[PDB]
Amino acid sequence: RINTVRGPITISEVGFTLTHEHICGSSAGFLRAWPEFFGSREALVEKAVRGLRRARAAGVRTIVDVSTFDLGRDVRLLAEVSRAADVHIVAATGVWLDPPLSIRMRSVEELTQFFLREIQYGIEDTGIRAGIIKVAITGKVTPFQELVLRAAARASLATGVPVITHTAGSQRGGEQQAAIFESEGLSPSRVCIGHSDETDDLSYLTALAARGYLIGLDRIPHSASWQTRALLIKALIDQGYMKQILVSNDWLFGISSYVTNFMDVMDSVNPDGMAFIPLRVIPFLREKGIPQETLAGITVTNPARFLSPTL
Amino acid sequence: RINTVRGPITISEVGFTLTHEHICGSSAGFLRAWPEFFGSREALVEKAVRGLRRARAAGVRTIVDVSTFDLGRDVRLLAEVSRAADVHIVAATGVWLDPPLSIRMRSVEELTQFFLREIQYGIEDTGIRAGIIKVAITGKVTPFQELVLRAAARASLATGVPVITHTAGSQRGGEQQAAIFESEGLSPSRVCIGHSDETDDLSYLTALAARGYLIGLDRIPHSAIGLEDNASATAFMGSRSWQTRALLIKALIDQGYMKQILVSNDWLFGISSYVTNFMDVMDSVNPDGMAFIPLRVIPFLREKGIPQETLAGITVTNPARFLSPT
Numbered sequence: 001r002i003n004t005v006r007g008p009i010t011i012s013e014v015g016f017t018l019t020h021e022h023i024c025g026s027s028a029g030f031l032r033a034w035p036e037f038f039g040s041r042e043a044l045v046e047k048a049v050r051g052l053r054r055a056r057a058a059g060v061r062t063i064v065d066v067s068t069f070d071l072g073r074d075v076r077l078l079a080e081v082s083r084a085a086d087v088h089i090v091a092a093t094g095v096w097l098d099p100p101l102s103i104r105m106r107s108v109e110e111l112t113q114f115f116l117r118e119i120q121y122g123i124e125d126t127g128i129r130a131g132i133i134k135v136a137i138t139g140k141v142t143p144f145q146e147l148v149l150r151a152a153a154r155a156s157l158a159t160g161v162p163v164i165t166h167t168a169g170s171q172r173g174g175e176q177q178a179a180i181f182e183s184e185g186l187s188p189s190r191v192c193i194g195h196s197d198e199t200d201d202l203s204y205l206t207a208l209a210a211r212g213y214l215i216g217l218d219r220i221p222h223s224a225s226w227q228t229r230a231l232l233i234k235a236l237i238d239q240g241y242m243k244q245i246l247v248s249n250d251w252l253f254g255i256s257s258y259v260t261n262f263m264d265v266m267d268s269v270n271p272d273g274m275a276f277i278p279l280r281v282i283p284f285l286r287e288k289g290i291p292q293e294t295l296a297g298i299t300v301t302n303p304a305r306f307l308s309p310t311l
Numbered sequence: 312r313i314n315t316v317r318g319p320i321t322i323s324e325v326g327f328t329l330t331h332e333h334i335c336g337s338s339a340g341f342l343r344a345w346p347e348f349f350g351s352r353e354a355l356v357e358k359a360v361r362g363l364r365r366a367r368a369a370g371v372r373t374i375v376d377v378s379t380f381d382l383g384r385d386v387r388l389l390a391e392v393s394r395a396a397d398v399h400i401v402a403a404t405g406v407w408l409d410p411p412l413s414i415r416m417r418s419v420e421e422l423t424q425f426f427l428r429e430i431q432y433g434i435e436d437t438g439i440r441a442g443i444i445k446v447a448i449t450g451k452v453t454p455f456q457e458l459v460l461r462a463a464a465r466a467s468l469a470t471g472v473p474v475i476t477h478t479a480g481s482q483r484g485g486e487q488q489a490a491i492f493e494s495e496g497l498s499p500s501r502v503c504i505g506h507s508d509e510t511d512d513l514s515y516l517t518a519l520a521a522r523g524y525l526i527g528l529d530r531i532p533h534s535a536i537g538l539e540d541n542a543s544a545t546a547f548m549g550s551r552s553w554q555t556r557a558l559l560i561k562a563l564i565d566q567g568y569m570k571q572i573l574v575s576n577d578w579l580f581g582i583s584s585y586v587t588n589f590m591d592v593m594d595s596v597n598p599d600g601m602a603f604i605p606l607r608v609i610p611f612l613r614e615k616g617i618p619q620e621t622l623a624g625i626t627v628t629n630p631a632r633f634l635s636p637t
C-alpha cells in the first residue's frame with residue numbers, strides 16, 4: 001500500500017499518476033504567516049481544487065507533491081485539496097534547495113532520522129506519512145547535498161519508499177547522484193532522476209535507464225519547445241526503456257519562492273496547468289504512433305511500481 | 312499600551328524587563344516538523360516554564376522575545392509559556408539572518424506590509440500582535456538587509472512600535488544601521504542597537520547614546536572563557552568575561568547615558584539553528600539562564616557603587632519608555 005494525505009491506498013487505486021507536482025511552492029511556515037501573499041488561503045485552495053479537478057477530468061487520479069519541508073509543504077492544505085478534488089496526493093520528505101539553518105547544520109545521521117520520522121511516524125502532528133523522498137542538488141553536489149543524498153538512500157533502504165531528485169543549473173548531473181546512491185547500496189529502481197527533459201543528450205539518458213534508474217521527463221510545459229521535450233519520451237520508448245519513464249508537469253497553484261506574480265507568468269505559458277500532460281502530451285505521443293497500452297504503462301504501471309514501497 | 316502574547320498591558324505592568332531574549336532559537340516550522348530534536352515539545356515547554364519561573368522569582372516581570380519568523384518564532388509556544396510562568400512576553404516581527412526565499416525575494420514595500428500585518432493584525436491566525444521589530448545585519452549591510460532596515464523604519468513610523476537590531480560577525484555596525492534609519496526619518500529613540508556589549512569601544516557606544524539611540528548591553532552572560540577547546544562556543548559567545556560586558560553598563564552610566572541603556576541575557580531554552588546540543592554548552596556556562604541579570608549583574612553593579620535607583624531606571628523605566636508605542 002501507498003501512503004497518501006488521506007491515508008493508505010492500494011496499488012489498484014493509484015491510477016493515472018503525475019509523479020512530480022506541487023500544490024504550492026513556498027517556504028516553511030510562510031503560507032501560515034502571510035497567506036495574503038497568495039490573496040488568501042481560501043483563494044489558493046479554490047484555485048488548487050479547480051486545477052486538480054481539471055486534471056482529474058483529463059484522467060489523472062493521483063499526484064505526487066514533491067514539496068519538502070523547506071519548500072513550504074503544508075500537508076493540511078494538501079489533505080483539504082485532495083478531499084475536495086477527489087485526487088489522491090502523495091506527500092514528500094527530503095530537502096530542496098533552501099534548507100534553513102536548523103536543517104543545513106544537521107549531520108547525515110540527523111537528516112536520516114528526520115526523513116524516517118516523516119515516513120514512519122508522520123508529518124508534524126497530522127499522522128500523514130510521506131510516500132516519497134525528494135532531493136534537489138546544484139551543478140556540483142555540495143558537501144551538504146551529499147549528506148542529504150546519503151540520508152535519503154538510508155531512509156529509502158529502511159522503508160522502501162522511493163527517491164526522486166533533480167539537478168538545478170545543469171542539463172545533466174544524474175551520474176553524480178547515481179554514484180552516491182550506489183555507494184550506499186540503494187537500488188537504481190528506487191530512484192527517479194528528475195527534470196531529465198532539460199537535456200537533449202539521449203545517450204546520457206539511455207545509459208542511466210540501462211542501469212535501472214527511472215527517468216523523470218517531468219518539466220515538459222516549462223519550455224517557455226514542449227514537443228521536442230516530449231519526443232524524448234518516444235526516443236526512450238524506441239530504445240526499449242518504456243518501463244523506466246515517468247512523466248509530469250512540475251506544476252503548482254501558488255509560488256512565493258521566486259519573484260512576485262511568477263504564478264501569473266507560468267499560467268500564461270501553460271493555461272492547461274496539471275492537465276497539460278494528459279491533454280497535450282498524451283495525444284501528441286499517440287499521433288506519433290505510440291500505442292495506448294504503452295502510454296498506459298508509462299502513466300499508470302510505472303508510477304505504481306515506483307511508489308509501492310519495495311525493500 | 313504594549314501588546315504581549317497574552318494581550319495588551321499598561322506601562323505600569325511591564326516591570327523589570329529583559330529586552331533581548333528568546334524562548335527557542337530555531338527555523339520557521341522546525342519545532343512543529345521535528346519536535347523530537349528538542350526531546351519533545353512538552354520537554355521544551357517544561358524547561359522554558361521552569362526557567363522563566365526562576366527569572367520571575369528573581370524579579371523579572373516582562374521579557375522581549377525577539378524571535379522572528381525566520382528564527383522559528385512559534386507564538387503559540389510563547390503564549391503557553393508566558394501563561395504558565397506568569398511572565399509577560401512581547402513578541403517580534405522582522406527578519407533575522409536566515410530568511411527563506413519567500414522572504415528574501417521580497418521588496419521593501421512587501422516587507423513593510425508583512426511587518427504591519429504582524430503588528431496591526433496578528434501573527435499567523437492567532438490574533439497575537441507583535442510589540443517590536445527585530446532586524447539583524449552582517450558586517451557590511453547587504454542590499455537585502457538594507458530593505459529590511461528600511462521596511463522596519465517604515466513600520467515603526469506607522470505603528471510607533473520600536474526596532475531592535477544586531478550585527479553578526481562584527482563588533483560594530485550601529486553607525487551603518489543608524490544612517491539608514493535616519494534616512495527614513497526614524498527617531499533614534501525608537502531604535503535599540505543590540506548586542507552592543509560585543510565591543511569595548513566606548514567612543515562608539517557613547518556617540519550612539521548621545522544621539523538618542525538605546526544601547527543594548529544584552530549578551531552579558533555569554534562567555535566561552537574556560538571552553539577554549541570548544542571552537543563553536545568561542546564563536547557564539549566570545550572570549551570576554553561577563554564582568555567585562557557588565558562594566559560597559561557602569562561606563563555608560565558614568566558618562567551620563569543611564570537613560571540610553573537596555574540590559575538582557577540573550578538567552579533561550581532551546582536552539583536548533585546552530586550545532587547540535589549547543590543548549591547544553593550555554594547551560595553549563597550560565598545555569599542561571601534568564602535570571603543571570605537580576606541575580607548576578609544587578610548586585611555586581613551595586614558592589615561597584617551604582618545606586619539602586621539607577622539600576623531600577625535601567626531595568627524598569629528605560630524598557631517601558633522603549634516598548635511603549637510612540
Ligand SMILES: [Cl-]
Nearest residue numbers: 066067096136
Ligand atoms: Cl522540487
Ligand SMILES: [Cl-]
Nearest residue numbers: 377378382407
Ligand atoms: Cl536574535
